[PDB]
Structure formats: C-alpha cells, structure tokens
Amino acid sequence: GRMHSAGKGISSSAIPYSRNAPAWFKLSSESVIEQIVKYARKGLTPSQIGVLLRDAHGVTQARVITGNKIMRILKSNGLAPEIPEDLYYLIKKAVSVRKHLERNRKDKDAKFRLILIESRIHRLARYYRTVAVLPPNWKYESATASALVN
C-alpha cells in the first residue's frame, strides 16, 4: 500500500455499522439534497460539500440520509463537472509543479515529483477512460493541461 511513497501508515475513516439512522437526525431528504445542490452551485467539490455538511450541518453520511452518493446527486442535477474531481486536483497540482520547474531548472526533486504525479494522472486517466466517463481519445498534455484547469 501507498504506491509512490514507501509510506505505509493506515489512515482511513471507520464507517459506522448503522447503515441508516441517526434516528436523532431530523430534517429530510429534501433538506440535505437542497443543501448539496446549493453548495454545488457555490462551486464546491462533492468532498467540500460532504465536509461542510458533516461539521456545521448534522449530516454524518450524506449517502445514508439520501441513498445517493454526493457526486451522483450533482450529476443528476446537471452539476456534473467535465472531469472527475480527483483527476482535476492531480492535474492542477501537476501544472503548478511544472510552473515551479520552469522557473527553477536547477531543481531535480521537482522533475521527480512531476514525473510521479503525471504518471498517477495517466494511470487514473486510463481507468476513467475505460469506464465510459472519458472519451477513448482523452489524453493529458502539458501545453493543454495548463488551460484545462485554469
């Protein structure tokens, strides 16, 4: 475990047994759903949404009170982004790293990390590409990613 690093720390959530509930939680599917869509419209990541609804709001697992993964909700409301979020953040990072390399050609470690990042980006790309979500022609390139994110 932990592919590019030699790190090995385990660090996941522990999801509750109670697949429904909280029982003490009021509101409605209506409520939280509405919340999701609004925040979405504020331009948020489905994750940003999950957290923002975990803390301030009393939404333990948005998928439980509404049998629908947050992302699926956003798609089913037209809010689905061009490319998945993880890939977005990978790419964004890559771009910034690149910028730093161009500014700093004397930096080897950056060349490294860039390679790494990029290679995750490509494996992942191939994945999504394989399950319909991205066109079998999709490809990451430096020139074009530059704009792809911003």
């Binding site: 475990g1 999801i15 047994y17 697949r19």
Partner: protein, 129 residues
C-alpha cells in the same frame, strides 16, 4: 495486495495451532473460505467457527482443537483430470488412510474421497491433515 483470501485464512489457522492456541481471528472470509472450514469441521480437524458480520467482507472466529497437523492451499488452482487426483493425494498426503485433498468441482467444493464417490472433477483448492 491481498491475493488468495483462502491462503491468509489457512496460514493463520496453522500458525495458531502451531503456537498452541485454540481460537483464530481470520480476515476477511469468503464463500470459499467458509466451504473450506465447513469441510474441515465436517471431518473434525476444527470445531466451530462464527462469521462475524462487519458491513465489509467479514471476519471468522474459528474454534480449533489440536488434532490438526497442517491444512493448506495449492496456490495455482490446478486442473485435475479425475485420475491425477490419485497423484495429488499421493504427493501431499502423509498416507493412504486419512487426510483429504479438497478441491473445486462442478458438483461443488469437496474432499477428494467425496469427489471420488460422486465422480466429478475440476480444480484443486487444497488439503487437510
């Protein structure tokens, strides 16, 4: 990454029995794991197990005695042609009078003798003595 669920299971059992104990916590329990344990039990090389359900893949708690030497898995589930069964048994069974080779056939997960009676074949899962 976790390769043969069966293998981690079996190895845990044997390491326990070797280390003297009577109970093992095995993770993470597959249908095949169960069938293996069901055969082992059915021929009394272990006692009673319990499929604890987390909402994941599960756990099993095996209560085992001490009358078990080695139970083991064959890593590449080789195909066996109804006559090569004899050969396998020969290779890994301590004698001709006990200890079962357990395999996967079209008529189920079963020990080599039960398979011998029902007269069906397929791949090989492992063995118990």
């Amino acid at each position: 990454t976790r390769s043969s669920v069966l293998a981690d299971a079996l190895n845990a059992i044997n390491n326990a029995e070797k280390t003297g104990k009577r109970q093992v916590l095995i993770r993470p329990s597959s249908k095949v794991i169960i069938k293996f344990l069901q055969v082992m039990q059915k021929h009394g090389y272990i006692g009673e197990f319990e499929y604890i359900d987390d909402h994941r893949s599960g756990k099993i708690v095996v209560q085992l005695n001490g009358r078990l030497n080695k139970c083991g898995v064959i890593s590449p589930r080789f195909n066996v042609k109804i006559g090569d069964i004899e050969k396998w048994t020969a290779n890994l069974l301590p004698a001709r009078q006990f200890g079962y080779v357990i395999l996967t056939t079209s008529a189920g997960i079963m020990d080599h003798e039960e398979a011998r009676r029902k007269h069906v074949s397929g791949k090989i899962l492992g063995f118990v003595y």
